[PDB]
Amino acid sequence: PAALTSALIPWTVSAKLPEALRGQAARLAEFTRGEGALRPADVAAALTRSRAALESRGVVLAEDREGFLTALDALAEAAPAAGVIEGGTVKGADRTVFVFPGQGSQWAGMAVELLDSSPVFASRLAECADALAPYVDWSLVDVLRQTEGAPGFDRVDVVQPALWAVMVSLAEVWRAAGVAPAAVIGHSQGEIAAAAVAGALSLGDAAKVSALRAKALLALAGKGGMVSVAEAADSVRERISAWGERLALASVNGPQSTVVSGDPGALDELMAACERDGVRARRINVDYASHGPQVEHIRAEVLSALSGIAPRTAEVPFLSTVTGEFVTGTDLDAEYWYRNLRNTVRFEDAVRTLLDRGHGAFVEASAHPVLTVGVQETIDAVGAPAVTQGTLRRDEGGAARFLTSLAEAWTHGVPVDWDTVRP
DSSP: OOSEEOSSEEEEEEESSHHHHHHHHHHHHHHHHTTSSOOHHHHHHHHSTTSOOOSEEEEEEESSHHHHHHHHHHHHTTOOOTTEEEEEOOTTTTSOEEEEOOTTOOOTTTTTTHHHHOHHHHHHHHHHHHHHTTTOSSOHHHHHHTOBTBOOTTSHHHHHHHHHHHHHHHHHHHHHTTOOOSEEEEOTTHHHHHHHHHTSSOHHHHHHHHHHHHHHHGGGTTSOEEEEEOSOHHHHHHHHHTTGGGEEEEEEEETTEEEEEEOHHHHHHHHHHHHHTTOOEEEESOOOOOSSGGGGGGHHHHHHHTTTOOOOOOSSOEEOTTTSSEEOSTTOSHHHHHHHHHSOEEHHHHHHHHHHTTOOEEEEOSSSOSSHHHHHHHHHHHTOOOEEEOSOBTTBOSHHHHHHHHHHHHHHTOOOOGGGEEO
């Protein structure tokens, strides 16, 4: 099965330097100008295969001759345009980290266009739907589409497993396209998708954790919230200390980027306090306070719902944002999944760990990028040569956006296999 199948076709070029790259673009443009009956699949073939690509890289995506012309002329002039991607390779980019976020990446119609342009997506997502089916009464594809008849994303027991299934399925497209993860990292619920991709849970077990943990959370909905605070974790911890159990440090996403959870009234006064200090604080659109004391109320339920899972050794390294260490995978039992919900998400710490181990590329396997800013903030503060990128975006959930994500990656030295993308 193809990773993607699209009318948008990629042509790849590379050189030893930017300036020579731009020359290759012009040569290619000269060739297409005189071509006439151009066969763009033939050209793409010819550009890739055996040839090993150089450090400075470019991709143009287009459906026809005229589209290739517009894109190549822009590439050759360093002008920016749709379907033009350019970049240079990054040390350690082939040790690519997959990132699985939590909440916030959903949108009506997310990835549903891919169903048609990706056999690998469609079949992994159908497996996710089978895995979920003992646990849920709604239809996965109908919820993704938000068809009349399906429940909405305003239910935590709907949105969380739908996102789980999307992220598990997007990751497998990256894999089918030749991008094997060197490690996975997850953010809250995202760890559940990460565990499934890494092989530390079966798909059935990961679906159960996703669905049944989300149901337990129903008891917290409407009783709390979260706010982002653009302040370092240490300062935030000191600041919220005054409120006690009414607030909690829910996530540390970057050196100046944290999320605080807790009771609605406490969150209002936290924001006012931040504002007083010139610190940007913003209310996130969720109505539960996870990663804090409220979660104690569903502990026994979570522990009991998930007593039967069978975690097992992970085939892809899994760096816990709960413990801040790589795990074997056999430790991802009910108590782990409770801890994940109860405790601070140490996202920045994990990223720093991976950066120090020389990983050069981070890929968010999501429907919309929500952690790409926080990865970039930690990359910048460390000064590492590494890149971060997403997969899809809101209102762009098909092969067009995915191909352009693969292109960005490839330009940075992520080892995309262009054969896997078919006309």
